[PDB]
Ligand binder design. Structure first.
Ligand SMILES: COC(=O)N[C@H](C(=O)N[C@@H](Cc1ccccc1)[C@@H](O)C[C@H](Cc1ccccc1)NC(=O)O[C@H]1CO[C@H]2OCC[C@H]21)C(C)C
Lengths: 99, 99
């Protein structure tokens, strides 16, 4: 579809068998989701933005469905205030900016 | 134009007569630029991000040119790690997300 930017571009995603709301974010290199218990091994990581860094758990080869479009990649889990879909998965669903 | 997301969506902007590089960021409500000397009056403000909050200078009704498209609106100036163009100006240049 086409998503305007008058409001935060929030969409429904499906991950680990759960439905969640997440922000489509062209300014994020990576995907960061709110604390959740995902199975499997993980690696510690630090990600930064405005204000500093937060500690997250890095999960690899995670399947996410974004408005019916499937993506598979690295997902970070930690104390983020909002679920963020970053460029690593947005490229897989063929998302582009247009103006 | 149409911009893919394999690389960071960086563009050249012109503000206060100076050229700078900035990130087109659908995950930002507001536009935040690195410390710089802008003409006009300003007010203190605080903005938050993934790491916490930072103190910024809020400039209102500022003219900014984003890849040749003119916008006039609120610009925040402070210790952000990268210049970000947020939704407040992205809407003025007619930017949308498509997939
Ligand atoms: C390589 O580094 C990265 O990719 N970092 C990503 C990242 O932080 N990206 C930033 C832009 C960015 C900033 C610094 C360095 C690189 C990019 C943005 O895209 C996403 C955030 C999301 C958000 C939304 C609401 C509350 C907290 C956080 N938006 C934001 O901070 O917006 C600010 C400014 O506007 C305000 O509205 C919303 C909050 C306010 C991480 C997500 C991985």
């Amino acid at each position: 579809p086409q998503i305007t930017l008058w409001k935060r571009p929030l969409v429904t995603i499906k991950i680990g068998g759960q439905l969640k709301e997440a922000l489509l974010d062209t300014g994020a290199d990576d995907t960061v989701l709110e604390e959740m218990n995902l199975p499997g091994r993980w690696k510690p990581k630090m990600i930064g933005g405005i204000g500093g860094f937060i500690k997250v758990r890095q999960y690899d080869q995670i399947l996410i469905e974004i408005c019916g479009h499937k993506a598979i990649g690295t997902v970070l889990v930690g104390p983020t205030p909002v679920n963020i879909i970053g460029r690593n998965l947005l490229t897989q669903i063929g998302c582009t900016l247009n103006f």
